[PDB]
Amino acid sequence: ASRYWVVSLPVQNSAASVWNRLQEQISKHSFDTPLYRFNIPNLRVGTLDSLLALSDDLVKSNSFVESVSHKIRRQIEELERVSGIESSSLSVDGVPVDTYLTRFVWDEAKYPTMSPLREIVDGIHTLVAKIEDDLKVRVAEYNNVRSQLNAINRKQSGSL
Amino acid sequence: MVRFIRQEAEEKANEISVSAEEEFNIEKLQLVEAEKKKIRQEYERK
Amino acid sequence: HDQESLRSSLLQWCYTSYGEVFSSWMHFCAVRVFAESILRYGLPPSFLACVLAPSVKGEKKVRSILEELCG
Amino acid sequence: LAAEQEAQHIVAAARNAKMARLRQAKEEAEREIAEHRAQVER
Amino acid sequence: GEFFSSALTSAAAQQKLGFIAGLVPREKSMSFERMLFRATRGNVFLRQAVVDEPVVDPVSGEKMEKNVFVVFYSGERAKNKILKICDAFGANRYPFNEEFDKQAQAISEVSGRL
Secondary structure (H helix, E strand, O other): OOOOOEOOOEHHHOOOOOHHHHOOOOHHHOOOOOOEOOOOOOOOOOOHHHHHHHHHHHHHHHHHHHHHHHHHHHHHHHOOOOOOOOOOOOOEOOEOHHHHOOOOHHHOOOOOOOOOHHHHHHHHHHHHHHHHHHHHHHHHHHHHHHHHOOOHHHOOOOOO | OHHHHHHHHHHHHHHHHHHHHHHHHHHHHHHHHHHHHHHHHHHHHO | OHHHHHHHHHHHHHHHHHHHHHHHHHHHHHHHHHHHHHHHOOOOOOEOOOEOOOOHHHHHHHHHHHHHHOO | OHHHHHOOHHHHHHHHHHHHHHHHHHHHHHHHHHHHHHHHHO | OOHHHHHHHHHHHHOOOEEOOEEOOOOOHHHHHOOOHHHHOOOOOEEEOOOOOOEEEOOEEEEEOOOEEEEEEOHHHHHHHHHHHHHHHOOOOOOOOOOHHHHHHHHHHHHHHO
16 A cells, blocks of 8 residues: 655644645645645643653554554455455545545544543554454454365366 | 743643642541541440 | 455455554544644644645655755 | 743642642541531530 | 853753753764754754864773763653764763853863873
């Protein structure tokens, strides 16, 4: 599949024509750039030490996201019958890739707690790990089924 | 920068103090419950 | 036949879990927006970046625009 | 600096003054206990 | 001790923080700014020398352009990476007292011992 491709810029460092022009009316329209975003801040933020800890844990979070992406792109596609879930069917946070990447509404109470995210990030990471574990269980079931496949019928067709 | 760190330190100190005060109130409720129990015991003895 | 069904029905549940993982990745990107905001700005979460999969030319133009905060 | 003044005695003052809230809780507990004791004695 | 009046003023102008006292060679200017962006975050202040004289290594008298510097750490979590950055600098690094007079006295005592 596709790895992470999000840009990095705070509110005070918008690259558009105006500070609020990042969402729309930016020069990216002239270049046909598909960039889109919508603010969704948390209830509160941690201290400087908490910020540094979150930055350190972001590496592990990205590694887990990459592992989940690799599992989803490999196990489903290799079966030649599981890749039928399109972007709308596999919509992120209930919105397709057109709208999922244009907003951060996934920060609601489902994976995080809509609260200081120092531990909410870890909780969401644990939830994603559980989802990836379920996907791995499904992949193991598919492997056992393939073991059931290529059964005694794989031998000769008789008189051999 | 530093002002944001100032707010976080004050907010953490304020929340900790409020939690400590609530815990002290709960401890006081338990203490008055124990005092009422022992007062009932001594009244029954009398 | 059971293996084919699992690749079509149980693996349909696997694809649903993949969509859930995509939702989790969207949440991770939302968290990373605030992480970058804290890293290169004040503590409160506030970001004006964007997330997409653009071409090389578009990314180069975005980098040229944002060179005021280059890495 | 400003951060040093923020992490200075400004917060430790409230941390120590939490003992005042604890003392108020103890005082109200004692008052309630004394009132209950007076009522039961009466 | 020089930073006790320079780095302190820089931090006051830019404003709990850690002490990043130590050293950073004349070639460590890029690593102090281009690198360690996650930890410093641009809100910290630092005072550094240009290695005006060849500073002897902590275990070698051959010396080099090992300028010494003192900075502010953005908490212990960021100080963990700041210590690694200072170790990567590999100059004549040694912590000193916060007070300018005490730091100068420590420098004089170390020079006399040397």
